[PDB]
Amino acid sequence: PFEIVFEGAKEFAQLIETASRLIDEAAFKVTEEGISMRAMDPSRVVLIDLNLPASIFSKYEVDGEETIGVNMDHLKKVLKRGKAKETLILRKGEENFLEISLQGTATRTFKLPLIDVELPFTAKVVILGDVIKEAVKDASLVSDSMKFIAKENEFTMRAEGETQEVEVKLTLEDEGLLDIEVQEETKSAYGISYLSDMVKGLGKADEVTIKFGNEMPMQMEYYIRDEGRLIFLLAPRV
Amino acid sequence: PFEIVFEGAKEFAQLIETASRLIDEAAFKVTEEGISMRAMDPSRVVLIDLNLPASIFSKYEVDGEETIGVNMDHLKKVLKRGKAKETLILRKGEENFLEISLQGTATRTFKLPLIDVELPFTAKVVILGDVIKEAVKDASLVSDSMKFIAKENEFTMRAEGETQEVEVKLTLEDEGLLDIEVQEETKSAYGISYLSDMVKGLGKADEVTIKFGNEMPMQMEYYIRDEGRLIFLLAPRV
Amino acid sequence: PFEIVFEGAKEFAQLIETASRLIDEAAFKVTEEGISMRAMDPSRVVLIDLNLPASIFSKYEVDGEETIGVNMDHLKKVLKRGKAKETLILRKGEENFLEISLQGTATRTFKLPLIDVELPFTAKVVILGDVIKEAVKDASLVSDSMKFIAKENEFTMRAEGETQEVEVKLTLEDEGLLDIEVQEETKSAYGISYLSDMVKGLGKADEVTIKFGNEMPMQMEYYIRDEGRLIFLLAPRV
Amino acid sequence: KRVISLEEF
Amino acid sequence: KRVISLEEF
Amino acid sequence: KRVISLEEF
């Protein structure tokens, strides 16, 4: 029996369109704290954790706790309909339905059925959103995978194919590395198909945190508004 | 033996690109009044009436009356070539040809052959161009048809599919309903494929008039410049 | 053993993306003068000559002369990665590799292998870049070829199909003809597929020079920065 | 659901 | 090259 | 109509 209102609806569609890109279905836990989504792609190689806390909503009226499951494709398509300055209202009554309304020149409400639900990091790097979006796209031109290498005071992503090779160095001098913290030399490789979905839509002004371990999974983290967060856990190669 | 000049040629291409979207061929009646196009799609479900009166042209030299028929695809493609601030000149000599010229940095003239030619409304609603463009696009996500319902002081478009449903209410309070005038409760349903062609390219500032009757055809009307007009008659469902 | 730095990298990608559009491979002669590319498409109907002289680079360190051959597709794709305000550095060591680096928020370096290497004009017209880009695109709507006709003080491109016809006149009055110089009446016809590649991406402010002879090849010339130049030799029809 | 024609009006 | 699963961590 | 080659010029 909840009523949840988010300003900047196009923004809200974006976050969900990320989460839609790797998983086909998802659970939304609504609670008086906030909204949570936790989920793994079909092949259990990536894990998504979305936390959207009460503060980022203009109205947040939850009564207890329940768990919405939705067709993420049909949700993606409804949420894409929101304009940038329009208001998003999410609503749930007794009936198994999500009411989504967008308000602008006129208010439109869409009803969508509910469906059935269901680390010792060596290196930590902070990096602007553009740098990593660019490296992933650069690397895709030459290979299906990208290596991450962190020595003390210097951070490298590199990929190699048959003929061609790519490498992007950053030291603390480099303009889009905010921070690096590595205990020991750290080297790991990750598939580009997943990285592309993870970093698609990351502005110059977006601080992205990445924690990695020698041949172990990457944790990528960036914030939604101030309070909310998205974390991606990605299993590595070999 | 006519010479007709329209400023804002990209604008002129737009109107014709509408009319092109549902019919494959069309008649243009040139007269000293203005230009007229009247035509029905292959399956006689929609009827287009375009009236472009002399005043909207910067030069309008007609000698009597004749009737041009053109391949609307080839006309669409030539008219698309006009820039937004460029001048359109239409011309016809004795020979079966339409001279179309666009003038800018240089003048280009295209010759296209002529081919062979060939209600008791309960509710009337006025509505901004964005609202209806949005409702049609919203409705297409859930069904192949949209319902229009008009009670006194309130106007609804709704559509329903197997799983999902959409509804857009407007009362006179709602920001993009200018006017509503309904004698009795009025309910009718129309195919979305036709509505999409009808409303594709309708600004926020475009007053669109819609007249409908219980299980009877919709009349949709909006203006070209001030004097000119486009009216679409659309047969309903069931 | 060279190091070559060009400002405005997106610009540099553009010029190469032209040259890529008709040829599959190309030779780059690096010398202390500048960089040269000379090449003919598979069917020996067009000939490209690119001259990029030292002055247009912010740093130009060449040691003698060598000749790079590259996969133009893989080069096109790497060069497309440059942003508009980013700096391009080209580099060659002893190993058969081209180092391409783009610098912005972070520096990215791509290594690409080297591969194996390999008129009595009547009329001369100067013309703005938009006019000819438009004429070619206009002409493509009606035919696979375009005629160029030059009499004294007047310049025409025309094309004709089965049904429809196009013609674009310019005299020295016409706003985008800068200059015309014709010894005698000159008429020649050229395929549109090649012309489209040649003129794709030509601003209003781009002086394009064209030299032609009765049933003989066209020479099209326009400048890169001030010092550098691109010349296309195109064999004619019939 | 049943799409008719304009001719009957 | 060998893509493993998250389950083993 | 007849497309020739550059070689003959």
Author numbering:
A (entry chain A), B (entry chain A), C (entry chain A): 2 to 119, 128 to 247
D (entry chain B), E (entry chain B), F (entry chain B): 1256 to 1264
Sentences reproduced from the published study:
Hence, across every domain of life, the extraordinary efficacy of the replicative polymerase complex is dependent on their interaction with sliding clamps, which encircle DNA and greatly enhance their processivity. We have shown that PolD uses two distinct PIP-boxes for molecular recognition of PCNA, which are located in the C-terminal region of their DP2 subunit.
The final model includes 9 of the 12 amino acids of the co-crystallized peptide. In contrast to the structure of iPIP, which differs from other structures of PIP-boxes, cPIP shares the same overall fold as those described in the literature. Hence, the cPIP structure shows an extended peptide chain, whose C-terminal region folds into a 310 helix. The cryo-EM and crystal structures reveal that cPIP and iPIP adopt redundant binding positions in the PCNA PIP-binding pocket.
